[PDB]
C-alpha cells in the first residue's frame, strides 16, 4: 500500500579509474527512469565526472558495454550532487532531511510516509564501511542510525538499500529499523569484482552485480509481476565470484509477494474529471555604464598618504617614559 | 508551426482564479503564475480510428502522459511549497482531434483528467472553423471560461473538497460566484487544524525519541525555543478547538507545525560525524 516512490542513487568514487561506479549509478538511473520514476523524484549524486573528464576518449559519453553499444549518459541526466559536494555528511543530510535551509527543491528528498524509497550506493567499501571519495567513510552504525531517524519521522514506507561494493553485506549487519530490505554484491569476507575491461576506453566499464541487475531489469516492464525473489537470485556464484547476500527479517511482508516495480518504478494515479465549476514620455534618456572609466577609477580612491603614528600617541608614550624615568631617578 | 496560441491568462486569473483563491485563502497563501511551453510533447502517441477520423488517449495510456512534460515543467527551485501544475494541451496537427476516453471507452465530456497531489491536464482541441483557412500558422485564441471551469473543478477535487453529499430529501443551493460554499471551507479548516496538530505531535515525539536514542545530537538554544513555541502552540490549538474558535485554532496549529519542523529539521542537529567508541582509548590513554 504505497502511492509514492523516491530514489537516491549515490556514486562515492572520485577518480577516473573508478569508471565502474559512475557507469553503475548512471545505468541504475536510466533503469529507474524508464520504469517511470520522475527525475524530480531522483536524487542522483555522482562523486566524479567521467563523461566530460578530459581523459575520456569519447567526450560527453559514459558507456556500459565493451563495444560502445549503450550510452547511459544520454542527454536528459539530472545530476543533483556532483564532485566535492558528494560527501558522507551531505548524504546523511539528504537522507535525514537536516539539509541547509537554502538548498533548492531539486537537491532534497521530500518523501512522505507512504513512500517506498530505493537507495543504490556503489563505491569502495570494507568491513562495515563504504568509503566516500577515498577520504571519509559511512559506517554501518551511522547508516543504521540515519535509517532509524527516517523511520521515526515516518518518511519511508519501505526501503530497498542496494549496495555494490567489496564486503557489501557488512553494511546492513546493524540495521534495526523495520520495513528495510538490503541487497549486497558480496558477503562479509568476499570482494566485489569488475566486468568488461575495455582497452579502447581504457578503464573497467561496469561491475558484474550491477551489470546483471541491469540485464535482469531490461526484461522488466510496468506490466511485469516479477517478485523480489528473482532479484535475490540474480548473479549466482557461477557468474559473480562473490556470492550476493540479503536480509529480509526487518521487512514485514513476504518477498514472494513484493513486486520489484514497487521499488524500481512508479505509475501515476489518474482520475477522469467529470465536474465543472460554472464560472460566469520621460525627457531624460537612460545611459549605459562606461566599461573602463579610467579618470573616475583613479579619483574614486582618495590620495595615498604615508602612515605616521598619532601625535597624541607619541606624546603619551614619551610622557609615560619620562614619568617612569623621574620616578626611578627621583 | 501550425498553431499560434494566444490565451488571456491575465484576465482569466484576475476574474476567476484570483477570486477563487481569495475564497480558498483561509487554508494558506496561494501563488499563481503561468507559462507557455513550446514543443512540449506528450509521451504516448495517440491511437487513430479510421471511422471517426479522430485520435484518442486510452485510459491505460493516461498515467504515462504527465511524466515527459514534467521535465519541461521544471523543479521551481525558488520556493519549497507544494506545486500544482495545470497544463492546457493543444494537440498538434498530426493528431488535432485528440480525445480522452474513460473506462467504458466513451469520450470524456471535459476532455481532461487530474492526478492526485500533482495537478491536471486538459486537452484543448481547436475548432475546424479556424482550420477553414489554408494559411498557417492559424491563430488560436482559447476560451478561458471553459478551460478555467475544468481547472477550478480539478483544484477543488485536489484540495479534498468534494461534491456535497446531500441528506435524503434535501435541496442544496446553487453555486456561488467564487465556486466554494463557506461551510466547505470550515470543513477544510477543521481537517487542516487536526492534521497540523497531529503532525506537530508526531514531530515532537520523534524529536524526543531521537534525543533519547542518539547522544551526539546538538540541541541549540534556537532549537529549544522552537520546541517550546511548538508545545505552547499545540496546547493552545487544542484548547481553542475544544472551545470552538476555528481561526485561532488554525493559526496556532500552523505555528506549531512551523516551529516543530524548524526544530526537528535544523541542520545544526547534525554537527559532527560519529567518532568510534572503540577508538577513544587511543585518544585518552597516551596522555592522561
Amino acid at each position: 500500500g504505497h502511492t509514492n516512490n523516491w530514489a537516491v542513487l549515490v556514486c562515492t568514487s572520485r577518480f577516473w579509474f573508478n569508471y565502474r561506479h559512475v557507469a553503475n549509478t548512471l545505468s541504475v538511473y536510466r533503469s529507474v527512469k524508464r520504469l517511470g520514476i520522475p527525475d524530480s523524484h531522483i536524487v542522483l549524486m555522482l562523486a566524479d565526472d567521467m563523461a566530460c573528464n578530459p581523459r575520456n576518449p569519447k567526450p560527453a559519453t559514459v558507456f556500459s558495454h565493451k563495444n560502445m553499444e549503450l550510452n547511459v549518459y544520454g542527454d536528459d541526466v539530472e545530476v543533483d550532487y556532483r564532485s566535492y559536494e558528494v560527501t558522507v555528511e551531505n548524504f546523511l543530510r539528504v537522507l535525514t532531511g537536516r539539509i541547509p535551509p537554502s538548498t533548492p527543491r531539486s537537491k532534497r528528498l521530500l518523501s512522505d510516509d507512504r513512500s517506498n524509497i530505493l537507495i543504490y550506493m556503489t563505491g569502495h567499501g570494507g568491513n562495515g564501511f563504504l568509503k566516500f571519495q577515498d577520504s571519509e567513510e559511512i559506517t554501518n552504525i551511522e547508516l543504521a542510525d540515519a535509517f532509524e531517524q527516517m523511520w521515526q519521522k515516518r518518511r519511508y514506507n519501505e526501503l530497498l538499500f542496494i549496495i555494490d561494493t567489496c564486503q557489501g553485506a557488512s553494511m546492513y549487519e546493524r540495521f534495526y529499523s523495520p520495513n528495510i530490505m538490503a541487497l549486497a554484491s558480496s558477503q562479509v569476507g568476499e570482494d566485489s569484482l569488475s566486468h568488461q575491461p575495455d582497452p579502447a576506453i581504457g578503464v573497467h566499464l561496469m561491475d558484474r552485480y550491477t551489470f546483471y541487475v541491469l540485464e535482469f531489469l531490461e526484461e522488466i516492464n510496468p506490466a511485469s509481476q516479477t517478485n523480489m525473489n528473482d532479484l535475490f537470485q540474480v548473479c549466482p556464484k557461477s557468474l559473480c565470484v562473490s556470492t550476493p547476500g540479503h536480509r529480509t527479517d526487518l521487512f514485514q511482508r513476504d518477498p514472494k509477494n513484493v513486486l520489484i516495480t514497487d521499488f524500481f518504478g512508479s505509475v501515476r494515479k489518474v482520475e477522469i474529471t467529470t465536474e465543472t465549476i460554472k464560472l460566469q514620455k520621460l525627457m531624460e534618456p537612460l545611459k549605459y555604464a562606461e566599461q573602463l572609466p579610467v579618470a573616475q577609477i583613479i579619483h574614486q580612491k582618495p590620495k595615498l598618504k604615508d602612515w605616521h603614528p598619532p601625535g597624541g600617541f607619541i606624546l603619551g608614550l614619551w610622557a609615560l617614559i619620562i614619568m617612569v624615568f623621574f620616578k626611578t631617578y627621583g | 508551426k501550425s498553431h499560434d496560441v494566444y490565451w488571456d491568462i491575465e484576465g482569466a486569473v484576475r476574474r476567476y482564479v484570483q477570486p477563487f483563491l481569495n475564497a480558498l485563502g483561509a487554508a494558506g497563501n496561494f501563488s499563481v503564475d503561468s507559462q507557455i511551453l513550446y514543443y512540449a510533447m506528450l509521451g504516448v502517441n495517440p491511437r487513430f480510428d479510421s471511422a471517426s477520423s479522430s485520435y484518442y488517449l486510452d485510459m491505460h495510456s493516461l498515467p504515462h502522459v504527465i511524466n515527459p512534460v514534467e521535465s519541461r515543467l521544471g523543479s521551481s527551485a525558488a520556493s519549497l511549497y507544494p506545486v500544482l501544475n495545470f497544463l492546457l494541451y493543444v494537440p498538434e496537427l498530426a493528431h488535432s482531434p485528440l480525445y480522452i476516453q474513460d473506462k467504458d471507452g466513451a469520450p470524456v465530456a471535459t476532455n481532461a483528467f487530474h492526478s492526485p497531489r500533482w495537478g491536471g491536464i486538459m486537452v484543448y482541441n481547436v475548432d475546424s472553423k479556424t482550420y477553414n483557412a489554408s494559411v498557417l500558422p492559424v491563430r488560436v485564441e482559447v476560451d478561458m471560461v471553459r478551460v478555467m471551469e475544468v481547472f477550478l473543478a480539478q483544484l477543488r477535487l485536489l484540495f479534498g473538497i468534494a461534491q456535497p453529499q446531500l441528506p435524503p430529501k434535501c435541496l442544496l443551493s446553487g453555486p456561488t460566484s467564487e465556486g466554494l460554499m463557506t461551510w466547505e471551507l470550515d470543513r477544510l479548516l477543521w481537517a487542516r487544524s487536526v492534521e497540523n496538530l497531529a503532525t506537530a505531535t508526531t514531530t515532537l515525539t520523534s524529536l524526543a525519541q531521537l534525543l533519547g536514542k542518539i547522544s551526539n545530537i546538538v540541541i541549540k538554544d534556537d532549537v529549544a525555543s522552537e520546541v517550546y513555541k511548538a508545545v505552547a502552540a499545540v496546547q493552545k490549538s487544542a484548547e481553542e478547538l475544544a472551545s470552538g474558535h476555528l481561526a485561532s485554532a488554525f493559526v496556532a496549529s500552523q505555528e506549531a507545525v512551523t516551529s516543530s519542523e524548524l526544530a526537528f529539521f535544523d541542520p545544526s542537529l547534525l554537527h559532527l560525524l560519529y567518532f568510534p567508541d572503540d577508538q577513544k582509548f587511543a585518544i585518552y590513554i597516551p596522555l592522561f
Binding site: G125, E137, D191 | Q279
Partner: peptide, 27 residues
C-alpha cells in the same frame, strides 16, 4: 576494497605507555 583509519593500539599505545610508566613511575 580499502582501509579505514584505525589506531595501532598494540604497536604504538603500548610502546609509548611503557616508555613512560616503567621508566618513571612504577620502579
Amino acid at each position: 576494497g580499502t582501509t579505514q583509519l584505525r589506531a595501532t593500539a598494540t604497536t604504538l599505545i603500548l610502546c609509548c605507555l611503557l616508555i613512560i610508566l616503567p621508566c618513571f613511575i612504577l620502579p
